[PDB]
Amino acid sequence: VRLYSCDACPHAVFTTHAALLAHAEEHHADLLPDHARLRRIAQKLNPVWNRALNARRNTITSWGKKIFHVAAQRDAGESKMQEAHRARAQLECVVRRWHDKARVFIFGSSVAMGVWDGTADIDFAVVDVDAMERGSWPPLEKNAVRSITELLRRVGFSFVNLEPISHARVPIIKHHASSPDVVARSIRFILNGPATREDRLLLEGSVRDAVGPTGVQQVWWNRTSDMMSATLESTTAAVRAAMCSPALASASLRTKVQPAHDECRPELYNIDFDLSFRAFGIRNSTLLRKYLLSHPCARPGAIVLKDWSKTSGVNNSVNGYFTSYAINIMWIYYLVQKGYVPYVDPLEIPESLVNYTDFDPRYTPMIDPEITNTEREELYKAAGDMLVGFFYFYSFEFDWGHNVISLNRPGITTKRMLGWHVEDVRHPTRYELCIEDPYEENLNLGRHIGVTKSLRVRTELYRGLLSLLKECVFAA
Ligand SMILES: [Cl-]
Ligand SMILES: [Zn+2]
Numbered sequence: 001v002r003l004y005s006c007d008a009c010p011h012a013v014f015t016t017h018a019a020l021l022a023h024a025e026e027h028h029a030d031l032l033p034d035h036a037r038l039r040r041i042a043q044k045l046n047p048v049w050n051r052a053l054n055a056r057r058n059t060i061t062s063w064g065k066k067i068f069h070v071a072a073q074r075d076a077g078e079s080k081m082q083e084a085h086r087a088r089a090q091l092e093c094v095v096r097r098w099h100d101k102a103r104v105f106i107f108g109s110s111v112a113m114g115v116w117d118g119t120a121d122i123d124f125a126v127v128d129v130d131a132m133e134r135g136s137w138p139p140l141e142k143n144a145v146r147s148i149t150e151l152l153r154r155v156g157f158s159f160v161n162l163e164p165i166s167h168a169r170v171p172i173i174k175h176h177a178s179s180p181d182v183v184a185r186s187i188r189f190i191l192n193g194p195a196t197r198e199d200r201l202l203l204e205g206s207v208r209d210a211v212g213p214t215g216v217q218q219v220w221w222n223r224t225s226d227m228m229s230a231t232l233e234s235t236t237a238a239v240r241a242a243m244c245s246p247a248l249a250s251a252s253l254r255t256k257v258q259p260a261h262d263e264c265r266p267e268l269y270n271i272d273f274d275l276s277f278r279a280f281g282i283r284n285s286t287l288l289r290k291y292l293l294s295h296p297c298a299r300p301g302a303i304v305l306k307d308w309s310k311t312s313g314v315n316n317s318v319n320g321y322f323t324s325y326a327i328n329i330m331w332i333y334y335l336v337q338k339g340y341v342p343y344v345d346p347l348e349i350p351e352s353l354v355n356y357t358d359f360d361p362r363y364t365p366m367i368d369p370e371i372t373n374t375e376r377e378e379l380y381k382a383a384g385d386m387l388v389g390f391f392y393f394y395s396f397e398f399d400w401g402h403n404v405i406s407l408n409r410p411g412i413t414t415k416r417m418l419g420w421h422v423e424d425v426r427h428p429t430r431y432e433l434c435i436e437d438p439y440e441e442n443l444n445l446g447r448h449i450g451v452t453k454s455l456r457v458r459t460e461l462y463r464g465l466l467s468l469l470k471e472c473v474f475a476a
Contacts, residue, residue: 005425007450013425017401024451032455038462042395045469049392056469061377063468064297064384068367070307070476071300075115075366084116085360087267090239091124091275094155097243098147099139101128105353106361111285112292112328113299114364122273125282129353138277141171148275149173155242156258157269173275178263185238186231186260189246191253194225199248203228203255210244211237235266279353280439284325286358287349287407287438291332294341297383298331299366304387304474305331312460312473320448321457326435329445333405334390343410346438384468391465395458406436420444433457 004020006012008028014020025036045052053060084106092104108123110116126148131137138144145166152162152173163174189203204219207230215237219230232238242257259265292298309315309327317323322330335341367379398405404420406413413436415421420431432454433446449457460473467473 002422003425004451005423005428006452007430008452010426020451021455024455028452031452032459034463035455035459038459038466042462042465045466046396052469053388059469059471060384060388061381062384063387063474064380064382066474067297067300067304067383067387068380071303071366074113074117074120074303076117078363080118081110081116081361081363083118083267084110084122084271086234086236087122087271087273088124088360089236090266090268091126091273093236093240093243094151095126095148097151097245098144099126099128101130102126103129103359105279105282105356105359107281107285109285110361111282111358112288113303114289114293114362115299115366116361119272122271123281123285124273124275125279126275126277127279127353129356132279132353137279141277142166144277145171145173154256155239156265161269170276170278175271175273175275177270177272180263182231183261183264184259184266185233185235186229187238187242187257188260189228189230189255189257191226191228191255193250193253195221195228195248195253196225196250199250199253200225200228202248203246204230206244206246207241210241215241229260239266239268279351282353282356283349283351283439287344287346288325288328288332290344290349291335291341292328293364294344295335296368296379297386298335298341300383301387301390302328302331305390308464308473311475312463314457314460320453322435322445322449326445329407329435329438330394330405331390333407334393335386336407336410338389338393340386344407345410346407351439388465388468391461391468394461395465400433400454400458404434404436407438408436418442430454 001015004014004017006020006023008024008031012023012027014023024032029036088104088106095102095104103126105125105127106122107125109120110122116122128137145164149162149164153159157175161176161178163176165172165174195203200221207219208216211232215233217231217233219228221228230241232241238259242259246255259269292302305327306315306324309322309324313321315322315324315327332341336343367376402414404413404415404418415431415434418436420434423429423431429444429447430450431444432451433449435445437443437445463473
């Protein structure tokens with residue numbers, strides 16, 4: 001026996017879950033206006049589910065073709081992925097001036113999905129692995145954010161584009177790219193006075209020493225010897241050169257440097273990114289990647305569910321709903337429980353980054369370019385079946401009342417196993433809809449979802465189920 005409290009009025013407490021749910025429909029139908037109606041429609045289909053699947057087989061396959069089309073738009077090919085690789089190397093040049101042993105790791109969807117569309121935000125983690133192993137990483141993050149912001153400003157990033165967030169719970173730097181080849185790999189040094197011949201040789205020397213023997217293609221000076229331009233062999237060499245620290249002979253002679261062009265610039269200037277100093281996101285993305293590569297329909301379904309979850313409002317963490325990570329866990333848990341992918345213990349992905357190699361995320365095409373028309377048709381059929389099955393599983397099979405969506409063990413996790421069978425009751429930690437975070441113990445990804453919010457979520461799962469049986473929440 002326990003207390004249950006309403007999340008939509010401050011006074012309603014009950015001693016049974018049934019009474020709580022009844023209260024939510026009876027007093028708060030304005031908050032969940034389609035719940036009872038869509039539940040009733042989907043409940044008509046349940047006793048005839050196999051018949052429905054059979055009759056709607058062509059439609060379900062058509063939805064699989066659409067799923068693969070949406071997924072294909074996220075796959076911009078290996079060359080586009082390599083643009084993110086170059087940006088990462090560019091950023092690493094910059095951050096090593098702050099901390100020589102820091103290295104830059106990409107995480108997020110380019111890791112989890114093995115593709116990048118050239119537009120999705122890139123996450124960069126900056127970590128000194130030796131220090132992390134000693135238990136001394138990150139250094140004070142507010143100061144790290146300010147230090148790296150200044151280095152970026154000095155290599156040509158504008159305050160228009162850079163947003164230091166030194167005081168968030170996790171301090172980060174956000175870079176917001178503006179919307180609009182030799183020029184892109186060229187830079188300009190402006191000097192505060194004229195350089196002597198010795199000074200010119202020293203500056204050129206500094207550039208050459210930064211990039212190595214093949215890095216410099218052309219160097220030239222203006223008539224007044226107060227600007228030097230340089231074309232480097234690549235955009236990455238161009239950033240490496242702009243990070244040099246000249247030691248000129250003439251007293252008080254100083255340089256400033258930026259790309260030779262205001263819009264045509266190295267990759268790092270052109271992409272949206274969040275820069276952070278912690279390792280946890282790397283591990284999360286690597287766990288997702290292992291699961292999502294293990295069935296050919298797993299990434300396409302994950303992509304369609306991310307978009308669905310945002311459009312339907314169930315993925316909206318700022319207002320207490322789920323995150324994109326939570327939605328991926330829902331999808332993967334379904335895949336594991338239904339036997340579409342093998343179980344992976346989150347503990348199989350090391351916390352330590354000592355053996356890490358994939359700083360640059362490995363590219364895997366969304367669909368095998370060599371499969372046959374027949375095989376492709378079979379993938380469409382499977383993708384549709386799997387997606388309909390996800391909405392059916394969460395609408396009728398999964399026990400939201402007593403169990404937890406969890407990848408931390410292969411079998412069923414009950415709320416009681418995690419101590420989530422009772423709430424401390426306001427804004428309580430809620431255990432209505434439970435999804436266990438793989439690496440943070442005792443964290444419910446549904447902790448802000450009280451009863452009325454949970455019925456909004458259930459509404460959308462019924463709506464998704466019904467929509468995939470018909471000719472839109474899934475519209476681009
Ligand atoms: Cl999110
Ligand atoms: Zn209420």
